[PDB]
Design a binder for this molecule. Structure first.
Ligand code: CL
Ligand code: CL
Ligand code: CL
Ligand code: CL
Ligand code: CL
Ligand code: CL
Lengths: 284, 284, 284, 284
């Protein structure tokens, strides 16, 4: 399984043509699962879920979708509230590929997208697995912006190698996972002019007049499916106090917290994460 | 596997002879695991872990120990702080059976016993699985006593069938698990004169001058092993806000919360509980 | 100041004529404040604020309003979502009295009414003082219904003096505040056919298709005024964990918690409450 | 009242002579109160309480004490656990001044010192007012070290004006309180070799084998006096989640939280803090 072997494109309509890049594996497995990556600079499906796709494709038909503005999907200079824009793109892909009701796995930004999708198109979303998710998290104790959000803003204003490294260090509990190669690789993807365009256009959409659609902690009492929340105890981006409203209000919620784990659960606890996701989604 | 086929006795020394009753299954399985039951009236190993022993004995050598004052273990009229008394009895059994370092699974009262044991005899305790545990729980938001503790006290003062039923109803989210047969069975065991003696002697030991040994939320930063905390979201005895100090201070802690689940996790989520315990303790 | 000297009536139109009883005091004083009582069986303005009205009336022009269904206000058998119903009546009274923008003080149910008024008529509500308020509270840890709400429901089904005394005793930390005289007086008002009609109507009102109107924790991020939340640490009706979403999301929030205090802050900590309220609303 | 008019020295024995600087005001007033400042680089009594001393001195006999390592008190290179060291010095000063039982007001580090004094010399501490206190705080959700503590550590390693300004800016909600004059004054005191010697010594002092002395959240259940905890909702040094164990376990606790307020409550909310403190300590 490689970037190239799994790479797929689709054209969907969201206020005009929109190119979506995704990865496909485990074709023929009975159960399809959609993976939605996190929102850090230079993030994309393949790099986000590298320690996971190969393992999950043993059990599931995996579609790992680059959200609009990331990886090889379109990087428009302007859009509405990001999670609803991303959910509309996903609905386009579901319709194009003929998907019915499919479970979603969403990390950070992609967890917000998974939830907005499950709220707006309730019959198309199955079980959700959400890792340090945006949108449905509200940090009842942590002052906003958090250390993780501040370092992301600083990179967006001064997109240097040093500021990217400072951002990546507050993603993980074990700062040795932040290797020169990782930094070099992510900096290379994050600093292209169209990636910077996509990241700037992000800032105006969470901060713009469309903000209420982002406040999904207000709405998740409506989710009817089982939802597994997964958190790193040491998450410095979306800290653990953000899980509480969703745990309380989602009728069939579950929460799993890993000690000695930051925001990148799927990396730092990759094995325990894969096993929890496989069991929760029904073993395939 | 039956009560009778699995039933075992040992005599250990704790301020004189003490008869311990336990159940044994999965003999010859490489990995021994000790189960410690909850503290409700008429509680014991076999009835507490009926939906679990058979499944766990497929993977582990299971010892399910009736704690002093419960089931067929000795029911003394007097003892010190209960968890240290129970941990001393367990240390006696470990020494008698030749056990080295063994993982412990503890529900409620038995979770407090497992923790006191792991603190006082650190080289004899392996991984801990703690379900709505006493001792290391401190309800930061819930006023004490909780609804569950109050109904237990009321039964202790007026040990009637009606007061036992009211206690058992706040153990579970789905009140239909509280069948006439369950009530009849538990009432029969709970209302014997020596069981009432054991339950009264309990009240004077958590409330007596030995109370600090009970406050194990103060001490669990010392645990060096992986610890899996398991909670019912709707636990009305030891509610979910009691998990927070242990989750924060145990270095290798994990927490799993089940929505639509009360204090009896091992009953209401028996399947998910068995699977989590099997994976966490290493699959056997 | 007496019940009779302060008594006033007004008629307002809320899907038809609606009689409202209120108490007026400190007519000399420039700053008006509206007081909205808690919602237990037999509650009313004069008794709910008996330790507060005389002290506040030295500084403010006090309007203590019997909410629809309570005291000498009309007790219809049918109405929509209670807090919205009571807020519409209060708004009718504001228009009749020629009030513009006025601070509100609200205990429990009255706190819910105050918040619904401030959200629906934002230009008419000044500073809010809310004591153990319903509506904006969401108990992130406590299983619902709480011990307090269950006792209130038991009285609705079986309106006996014993069930009312049991409810009143979980209202307060110091159970000696629940004197035989208080129980006899509240029970005499609560047990009338008109009051019980009101009590049941209010119940039904909270679980319709307008349930969203009761979930005010979703909306208080829009409040622009200073808001003083006041809680008893030992509130067993609306416990302390219910304060967190409001404290986080109300921009100019403050929280005062009293140890050794239950749900009736204005009674149990009357002197500290009187002083917090006078200072917060500007000393008059 | 001036720095010079109020200035006083005393010598006490704490493993050898120890010079203590303090400010004395309101000598007429019957009720003594001891003020203990926060612990940032260059902090001292006069500047830390500059918005409070004159107001409190109208009601109380004020003793504002420069803790060892700060202001004009001795700055040894070596000492044990800081709060215990500072508490021993204060106790030496109580004995020299002939004080019995006196209320203490403590910000941050000074809050930690106040609590250690009240635990080690229980008959000598009256009512406690603690603002964003160290020592009794345990951040149940925030990963440690917090943003605030990390900025303080960065200054210890690289004591520049830029690193001090960055630290001071995470101390407060309203960043305009961090004026060029304030930064220049604090930095001039913090950068002296004596102060930096103190700053580093204090660091080392917290991670010895006497670390348990710093974990005061384990011990404050033993405090018998009223304790007013005061917090900024936006404290990024000792965040709000650090209040919970103390509020739960101190029998006569109260908590006041201020929205739009960081770690320097006595500065950012000086008027509300002055009034809370005067009323709590009995008006003098
Ligand atoms: Cl860092
Ligand atoms: Cl399902
Ligand atoms: Cl019940
Ligand atoms: Cl291990
Ligand atoms: Cl105002
Ligand atoms: Cl006192």
């Amino acid at each position: 399984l490689t970037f190239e072997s799994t790479s797929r494109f689709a054209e969907v309509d969201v206020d005009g043509p929109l190119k979506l890049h995704y990865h496909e594996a485990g074709v023929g497995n009975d159960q399809t699962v959609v993976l939605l990556h996190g929102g850090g600079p230079g993030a994309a499906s393949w790099t986000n879920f590298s320690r996971n796709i190969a393992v999950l494709a043993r059990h599931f038909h995996v579609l790992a979708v680059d959200q609009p503005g990331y990886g090889h999907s379109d990087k428009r200079a302007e859009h509405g509230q990001f999670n609803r824009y991303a959910a509309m793109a996903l609905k386009g892909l579901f319709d194009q590929l003929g998907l019915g009701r499919v479970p979603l796995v969403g990390n950070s930004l992609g967890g917000g997208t998974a939830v907005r999708f499950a709220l707006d198109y309730p019959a198309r979303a199955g079980r959700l697995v959400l890792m340090g998710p945006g949108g449905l998290s509200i940090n009842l104790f942590a002052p906003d912006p958090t250390e993780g959000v501040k370092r992301l803003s600083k990179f967006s204003v001064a997109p240097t190698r040093e500021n990217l490294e400072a951002f990546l260090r507050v993603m993980v509990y074990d700062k040795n996972l932040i290797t020169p190669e990782l930094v070099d690789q992510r900096f290379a993807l994050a600093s292209t002019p169209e990636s910077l365009t996509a990241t700037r256009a992000m800032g105006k959409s969470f901060a713009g007049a469309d903000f209420e659609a982002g406040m999904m902690w207000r709405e998740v009492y409506r989710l009817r499916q089982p939802v597994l929340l997964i958190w790193g105890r040491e998450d410095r981006v979306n800290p653990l106090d953000g899980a509480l409203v969703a745990l309380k209000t989602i009728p069939r919620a579950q929460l799993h917290v890993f000690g000695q784990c930051g925001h990148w659960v799927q990396v730092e606890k990759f094995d325990e994460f894969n096993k929890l996701t496989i069991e929760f989604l029904g073993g395939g």
